[PDB]
Amino acid sequence: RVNSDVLTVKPLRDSVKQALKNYFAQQDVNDLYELVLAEVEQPLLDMVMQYTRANQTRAALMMGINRGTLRKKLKKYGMN
Amino acid sequence: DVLTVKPLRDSVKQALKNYFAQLVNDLYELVLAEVEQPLLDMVMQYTRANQTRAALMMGINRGTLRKKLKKYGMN
């Protein structure tokens, strides 16, 4: 069972699996979560800010997080 | 540069563009679910369902790994 099917590029999840499958094809790894998280959070923050015209309050409300959390993530990726 | 399909991030951007055209207050959780689930699937597949090895590869403790698995009903 999967949460939703509203993210397609077909489903986004399929793209994540292939990227991981391709990655595994090549070896110790110890930061795969952060690796994936950063690769997904950056584009998400970018698109949400574009959709909301950089209105941080609107962006956080759309994402379902508070203002401070959004700003923290934005800073992490030098997007502040 | 390590996660490609080309970079994975480009697929996330396109996915969101398509989604926005269909229009919300749970976008973060919604995307996290679509990303974490497959990640957990692939790592557990890679380690033959060995949670310790999976947790170590991901860089999270075993307790956190098990919490995520449960969150997504992957017990």
DSSP assignment string, A11-73: BHHHHHHHHHHHHHT----S-HHHHHHHHHHHHHHHHHHHHTTT-HHHHHHHHTS-HHHHHHH
Is the distance from CB of B18 to CB of A51 less than 8 angstroms?
Answer: no
Query: In whole angstroms, what is the distance from residue B43 CA to residue B6 CA?
Result: 22
Experimental method: X-ray
Opening angle at CA A60, ends B7 and B35, nearest 5: 35
| Structure token pair of residue A32 | 């795969």
Beta-carbon separation of A36 and B7 below 8 A: no
Domain ranges of chain B: 1-75
What is the C-alpha separation between A16 and B39, in angstroms, rounded? 7
CB A57 within 8 A of CB A68: no
Q: How far is the alpha carbon of B62 from chain A, nearest alpha carbon, in Å?
A: 13
Contacts of A11 in chain B (CB under 8 A): 34
Residues from chain B contacting residue A8 (CB–CB below 8 Å): 15, 18
Q: Does A15 touch chain B (CB under 8 A)?
A: yes
Identify how many contiguous H helices and E strands chain B contains and give both numbers.
4, 0
Q: Which amino acid is at A36?
A: V
φ/ψ (deg, to 5) at B4 = -130, 165
Closest CA to A64 of B9, B14, A73: A73
CATH code: domain A1-80 is 1.10.10.60
- Topology annotation, domain B1-75: Arc Repressor Mutant, subunit A (1.10.10)
